[PDB]
What we know:
This is part of a larger assembly, with 2 copies of chain A.
Chain A: E1 25-30, E2 33-41, E3 52-54, E4 60-64, E5 71-76, E6 84-85, E7 96-97
Antiparallel strand pairs in A: 1-2, 2-5, 3-4, 4-5, 6-7
PDB class: viral protein
Keywords: Antibody, Spike, Complex, viral protein
Chains A, B: Spike glycoprotein
Amino acid sequence: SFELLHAPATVCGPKKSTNLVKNKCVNFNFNGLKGTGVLTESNKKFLPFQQFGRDIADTTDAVRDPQTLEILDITPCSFGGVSVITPGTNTSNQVAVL
Amino acid sequence: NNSIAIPTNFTISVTTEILPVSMTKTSVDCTMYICGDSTECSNLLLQYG
C-alpha cells in the first residue's frame, strides 16, 4: 500500500538522474512528475514538508529539485496562434504570417 | 375643465446614457486547454471530433 505524488518520496525506481538544465524548454521527470516546460530558479519559498507547489488550475507551477533541494519555477513553453495574412490567390501567392 | 398650466421658465438639462458597444475578444486553444503538454492526449483528441 502506497500513496502517489503528494509528498517527498523515499522509495524510487531504478531510473537514473540527469543533470538539470535551466532556461530551456525541456521534458522533465522530477520524482515521477512529467511535464514539458522552461525551468527557472524561483524567488519564492517553500516549507520543508512541501515538495510540490500547485496553481489555481491544480497544475504544478514550482517543484523542489530532488538532490539539490532548490525550488524551480515551471513555466509552459512558449505557444501562440498563427494567422496568415494573404492577398487573394488570384492576385498573388505571397503571404505574411502573424 | 377651464384651467391650464403653462410653463413660464425653462431649464436646460444634460443627462448621461451609457451603452455597451463591444466585448472582449477571446481565442481558446482547444489542444492546450484539454490536453496541456501531453502528446498522447492530443492524439486521442483528434479522434474525438
